[PDB]
């Protein structure tokens, strides 16, 4: 019944602040909830769009400020003094009934960094891979043979560690397919205008 | 604050099975006004949560009647009479009797059952390209296994190395219902040139003994 459109991904340094928006349409208190990397949910607080009254989780009361712009049917969440614990997906929720699509916030000291892309060649079926290391921010995209190779692929979720991301992908094909045919991973990182093709060669 | 405890953490089912999931609160959710503010949400893979049941047993608009909620006081249950593919995802309970703060259970993942499957394990030495830049990552894929729990250790010249490991896991495969894992051990080139024997070792339900793949740097 109510649709909630949230603003796009945010990237901030430790100690900085973030402001995220939630535009409501259709026809209740606006709640904000954090979803942590392990999927756990934490309620931040709520605001009455009518008069502007608020209620906060004591955990967030010192750093979070909720506001509403009635003229634009838009709710805002401001969160200051950010730490890595605040790297999460933030949802606005109307009446605890309808959820927005979520806004990612990443809190990191990292600067934009292009990935290094490394071929993973083997030491009836053969497994090859592609290691995409040391990039920031998300996302990267990875395909095999320009997308024509889609079966037998496992592309793993990116993981942030020491303030850079790593991703990897494996592809498994019949032994008669490679190296008799070519296998290439195609990696794109738009934030750094990176587009690389890494052909996997026998060692 | 009220602690919501959900069990089990993971519930594997076959399509068509009944499913029951439990949510227990650290104290009674009966409010002084007579209401019990216990609610259930489903978050399907890649989506935002959706409300299924509010105030113990009220089905939210559009929710099919195969979903039902029951319980009282501190003990609550969500039942699915017959599980469908579209029901797979993470179920959360929440309480709003004792606020602030409203609190949530940790989630129960409703997943598909299939036959046990041993992982296909593949190990990869550093690429020549990476070595040129002075780094040395060793990668192990453990692919298409079931059930989901698995443990990996890296052992170098017969001794475990814990520093420099980065692990990632896929969600349940849409085609074969299996799970996969990637483990990357990142060393400096100097460290790599100090030891020659590299082993990726896993434990998994499918074997009483460790599952291993190895290589010798010196070929």
């Amino acid at each position: 019944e109510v649709q909630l459109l949230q603003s796009g991904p945010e990237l901030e340094k430790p100690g900085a602040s973030v402001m995220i928006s939630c535009k409501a349409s259709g026809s209740y208190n606006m709640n904000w909830v954090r979803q942590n990397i392990g999927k756990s949910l934490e309620w931040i607080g709520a605001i009455d769009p009518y008069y502007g009254g608020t209620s906060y989780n004591q955990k967030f009361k010192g750093r979070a400020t909720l506001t509403v712009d009635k003229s634009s049917s838009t709710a805002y969440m401001h969160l200051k003094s950010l730490t890595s614990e605040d790297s999460a997906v933030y949802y606005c929720v109307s009446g605890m009934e309808y959820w927005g699509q979520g806004t990612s916030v990443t809190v990191s000291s990292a600067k934009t960094t292009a990935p290094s892309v490394y071929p993973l060649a083997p030491v009836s079926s053969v497994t090859l891979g592609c290691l995409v290391k040391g990039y920031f921010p998300e996302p990267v995209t990875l395909t095999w043979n320009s997308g024509s190779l889609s079966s037998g692929v496992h592309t793993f979720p990116a993981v942030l560690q020491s303030d850079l991301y790593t991703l990897s992908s494996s592809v498994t094909v019949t032994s008669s397919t490679w190296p008799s045919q070519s296998i290439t991973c195609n990696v794109a990182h738009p934030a750094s205008s990176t587009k690389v093709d890494k052909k996997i060669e026998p060692r | 604050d009220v602690v919501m405890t959900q069990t089990p953490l993971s519930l594997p089912v076959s399509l068509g099975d009944q499913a029951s999931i439990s949510c227990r609160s650290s104290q009674s959710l009966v409010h002084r006004n007579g209401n019990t503010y216990l609610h259930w949400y489903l978050q399907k893979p890649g989506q935002s949560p959706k409300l299924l049941i509010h105030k113990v047993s009220n089905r939210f608009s559009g929710v099919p009647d195969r979903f039902s909620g029951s319980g009282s006081g501190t003990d609550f249950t969500l039942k699915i009479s017959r599980v469908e593919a579209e029901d797979l995802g993470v179920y959360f309970c929440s309480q709003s009797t004792h606020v602030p703060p409203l609190t949530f259970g940790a989630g129960t993942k409703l997943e598909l059952k299939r036959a046990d499957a041993a992982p296909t394990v593949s190990i990869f030495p550093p690429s020549s390209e990476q070595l040129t830049s002075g780094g040395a990552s060793v990668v192990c894929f453990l692919n298409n296994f079931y059930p989901k729990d698995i443990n990996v250790k890296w052992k170098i010249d017969g001794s475990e190395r814990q520093n420099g490991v980065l692990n990632s896991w896929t969600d349940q495969d849409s085609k074969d219902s299996t799970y996969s894992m990637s483990s990357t051990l990142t060393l400096t080139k100097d460290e790599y040139e100090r030891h020659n024997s590299y082993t990726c070792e896993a434990t998994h339900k499918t074997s009483t003994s460790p599952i291993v793949k190895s290589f010798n740097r010196n070929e």
Side-chain angles (χ1 to χ4, degrees), chain A residues 2-22 24-26 29-38 40-49 52-69 71-84 86-110 112-194 196-203, chain B residues 1-17 19-23 25-31 33-49 51-162 164-174 176-219:
Chain A
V2 59
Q3 287 288 325
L4 301 176
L5 179 66
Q6 298 186 231
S7 46
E10 303 278 354
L11 305 174
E12 306 290 343
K13 304 291 175 55
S17 299
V18 71
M19 179 76 76
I20 66 186
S21 66
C22 173
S25 58
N29 293 336
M30 188 64 80
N31 296 262
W32 293 83
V33 175
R34 195 166 77 177
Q35 184 161 48
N36 305 304
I37 191 175
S40 64
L41 296 165
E42 293 179 76
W43 181 85
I44 295 167
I47 183 167
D48 169 31
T54 55
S55 178
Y56 294 91
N57 188 332
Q58 63 84 32
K59 177 172 178 175
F60 296 101
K61 186 178 179 178
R63 302 188 300 125
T65 305
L66 306 183
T67 54
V68 288
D69 188 351
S71 70
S72 63
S73 293
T74 304
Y76 300 92
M77 188 206 74
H78 185 261
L79 185 65
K80 72 183 182 182
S81 302
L82 294 166
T83 77
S84 60
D86 300 309
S87 294
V89 175
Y90 293 78
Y91 290 102
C92 61
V93 197
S94 178
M96 291 308 305
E97 294 177 344
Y98 296 97
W99 296 63
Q101 87 278 15
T103 296
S104 174
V105 178
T106 303
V107 184
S108 173
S109 61
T112 298
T113 308
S116 299
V117 179
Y118 303 127
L120 300 173
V123 295
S124 61
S125 75
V126 59
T127 296
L128 313 182
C130 192
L131 175 60
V132 182
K133 188 166 175 51
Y135 68 92
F136 191 86
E138 280 268 81
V140 298
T141 61
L142 183 154
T143 61
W144 290 98
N145 284 5
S146 302
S148 69
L149 184 48
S150 56
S151 176
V153 172
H154 299 292
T155 296
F156 295 87
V159 170
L160 187 65
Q161 195 187 83
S162 302
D163 301 278
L164 292 174
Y165 288 98
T166 297
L167 172 149
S168 62
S169 180
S170 68
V171 63
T172 302
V173 300
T174 61
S175 182
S176 60
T177 322
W178 183 92
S180 55
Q181 309 179 14
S182 295
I183 300 291
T184 300
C185 70
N186 325 103
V187 175
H189 185 239
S192 66
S193 296
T194 298
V196 290
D197 299 316
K198 176 61 59 176
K199 187 174 190 302
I200 314 303
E201 304 281 359
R203 297 179 185 264
Chain B
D1 307 350
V2 182
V3 175
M4 304 298 290
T5 299
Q6 285 184 251
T7 50
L9 292 195
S10 174
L11 181 60
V13 294
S14 297
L15 300 180
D17 283 354
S20 180
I21 64 177
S22 167
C23 177
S25 57
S26 57
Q27 65 184 269
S28 172
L29 299 184
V30 179
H31 194 275
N33 69 20
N35 287 322
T36 301
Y37 296 102
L38 185 281
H39 326 289
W40 291 97
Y41 299 88
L42 168 60
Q43 184 175 33
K44 294 175 190 197
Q47 295 184 15
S48 65
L51 179 59
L52 298 180
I53 304 290
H54 62 105
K55 295 186 294 190
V56 185
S57 64
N58 295 269
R59 271 189 290 117
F60 195 55
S61 180
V63 177
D65 75 350
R66 64 174 178 275
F67 291 97
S68 65
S70 65
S72 66
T74 62
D75 175 72
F76 304 92
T77 302
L78 178 68
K79 291 181 183 298
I80 309 172
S81 56
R82 185 194 163 85
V83 172
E84 302 295 344
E86 68 177 338
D87 304 333
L88 301 174
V90 181
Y91 289 81
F92 296 95
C93 62
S94 74
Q95 70 82 26
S96 58
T97 294
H98 303 283
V99 298
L102 178 160
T103 57
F104 294 92
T108 291
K109 199 175 282 277
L110 187 67
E111 300 181 88
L112 280 178
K113 189 184 308 174
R114 58 149 292 141
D116 288 357
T120 298
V121 185
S122 304
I123 192 170
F124 300 88
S127 65
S128 60
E129 293 97 327
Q130 186 181 25
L131 286 169
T132 295
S133 60
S137 297
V138 190
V139 178
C140 188
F141 296 120
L142 309 95
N143 287 346
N144 300 86
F145 58 85
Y146 189 90
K148 66 194 304 296
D149 291 347
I150 196 165
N151 282 307
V152 173
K153 293 177 175 294
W154 283 94
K155 293 181 178 179
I156 299 179
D157 285 357
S159 292
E160 184 177 0
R161 170 153 184 155
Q162 295 185 355
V165 181
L166 185 150
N167 292 333
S168 185
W169 302 264
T170 53
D171 295 329
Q172 187 164 43
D173 188 88
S174 62
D176 73 4
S177 295
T178 65
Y179 296 90
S180 296
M181 178 179 181
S182 173
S183 186
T184 301
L185 170 63
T186 294
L187 307 171
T188 64
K189 173 156 67 179
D190 198 78
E191 286 174 318
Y192 185 66
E193 294 178 346
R194 192 177 307 155
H195 298 290
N196 69 303
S197 307
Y198 292 84
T199 289
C200 173
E201 177 198 87
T203 64
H204 188 252
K205 175 183 181 196
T206 52
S207 185
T208 55
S209 58
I211 306 165
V212 289
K213 280 298 181 76
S214 308
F215 71 89
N216 181 348
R217 178 197 73 208
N218 300 322
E219 197 83 31

